């Protein structure tokens, strides 16, 4: 199945007390493998997964230098943006950056991306063709004009399509147990009569990886259903993910429904049902 | 692998 490795960068200005806070994190699929937090003593790019530790010292010294560079660029920005948006030195603002690789089942290149945001909104992003820029507002225009002048896109392309993919499959090869595993949903159900008449079933699913997973209810004629309270997939914390989707039915007339779990980890898609 | 280029000031 497809894979990927992204890098998320967040920088928050703290007017009145020290340099902005810089927190960068690296993922491969749904697995974190590195991090950095200017508020840590370390002041080094740290590991967050077994395989990634195997990397040599030159690696970290290198990755650390880079990230700090990313951090420095963000700092400078934070200043610039206030400028572009006529905003006082008092307020706190936020700069975000995310870029990564997508590869196919054949570990080949699929798409690349590099997005930047300010105060929770899109500032400027590189299009799919790893060539064009999408300027959010009047401010971003200024940026995509200098970014075009300096042929930033070209540099990013070189990386996205080139380096990022190699190292991705490099990591996929070393984390061949983690990144390339595939846990399965330990599904289970729960009742919950809303007192007489109606009832609410809860179709659970815990301990699965990757997080991608669908669980839809159905019944007789056509499958589907609305009144289905589906909660966003959450991290179990141990590396797997939890999630469930509840729906509402009329006492008894209930044992005529069932949610269908779909997940690559499942050789055969499950269709759990109720049985009291 | 962090990007080694294509990163500049906005």
């Amino acid at each position: 199945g497809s894979h990927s490795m992204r890098y998320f960068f967040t920088s928050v200005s703290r007017p009145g007390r020290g340099e902005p806070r810089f927190i960068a994190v690296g993922y491969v699929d749904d697995t974190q493998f590195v991090r950095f937090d200017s508020d840590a003593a370390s002041q080094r790019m740290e590991p967050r997964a077994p395989w990634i530790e195997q990397e040599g010292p030159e690696y970290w010294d290198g990755e650390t230098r880079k990230v700090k560079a990313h951090s420095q660029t963000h700092r400078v920005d934070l200043g610039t943006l206030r400028g572009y948006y006529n905003q006082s030195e008092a307020g706190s603002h936020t700069v975000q950056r995310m870029y990564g690789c997508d590869v196919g089942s054949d570990w080949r290149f699929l798409r690349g991306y590099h997005q930047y945001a300010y105060d929770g909104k899109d500032y400027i992003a590189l299009k799919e063709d790893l060539r064009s820029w999408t300027a959010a507002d009047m401010a971003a225009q200024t940026t995509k004009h200098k970014w075009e002048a300096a042929h930033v896109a070209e540099q990013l392309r070189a990386y996205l399509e080139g380096t990022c993919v190699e190292w991705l499959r490099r990591y996929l090869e070393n984390g061949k147990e983690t990144l390339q595993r595939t846990d399965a949903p330990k599904t289970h159900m729960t009742h919950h009569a809303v007192s007489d008449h109606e009832a609410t079933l809860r179709c659970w699913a815990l301990s699965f990886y990757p997080a991608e997973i669908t669980l839809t209810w159905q019944r007789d004629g056509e499958d589907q259903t609305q009144d289905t309270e589906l909660v966003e997939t959450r991290p179990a914390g141990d590396g797997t993910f939890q999630k469930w989707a509840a729906v509402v039915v009329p006492s008894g007339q209930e044992q005529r429904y069932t949610c269908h779990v779909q997940h690559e980890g499942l050789p055969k898609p499950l269709t759990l049902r109720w049985e009291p | 692998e962090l990007a080694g280029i294509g990163i500049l000031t906005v």
Partner: T-cell receptor
Amino acid sequence: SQTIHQWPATLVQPVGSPLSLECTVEGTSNPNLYWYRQAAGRGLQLLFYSVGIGQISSEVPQNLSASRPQDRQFILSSKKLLLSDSGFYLCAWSETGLGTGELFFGEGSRLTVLE
Amino acid sequence: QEVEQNSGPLSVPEGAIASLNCTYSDRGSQSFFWYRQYSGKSPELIMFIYSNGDKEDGRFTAQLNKASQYVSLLIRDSQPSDSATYLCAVNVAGKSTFGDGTTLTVKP
């Protein structure tokens, strides 16, 4: 050099002597400053690297020191030079960030440590 | 090792083409350069490359092959003033790593 300056240009100093090298950059801001060194034959060696103001980072167990007292004032110094310290010290800068790479060098500074 | 130039000095007759090679070991390298240094003066950039292929500028042509971790430089119609040391550089680990350079001598 129309953006980077380095002095002194030539230094013939005696062993155990103190060293101070200054580098000035004009025409950019919050740039990446580096102290390379050219001894033995050719080939630059990275002695120091600064991501930003007052941020130094030795790249090898060394005897020299470096500081960046200001966005554009980079300095290299030694408590007391050792013959080993001889070499052609080069200061360079790359644009704030981590782009195409490409650093701009200065006049350079030749240091001959005599015994 | 890491950046490996071939030293020199090479001899090329005025007019001929000058080939220069460089090999980088760290596959993390993401941009490559060629600096020219004249005995005395400091290193002066001639070209940089960050995508497989050939990049032309005047009598200069860089050639990058990430697959071979190979970066070259050709100096078409070489002149005696091209004589110098050409330093190959590799932008990696948030910095530039240099080779010990390769001396060039264009016999007139």
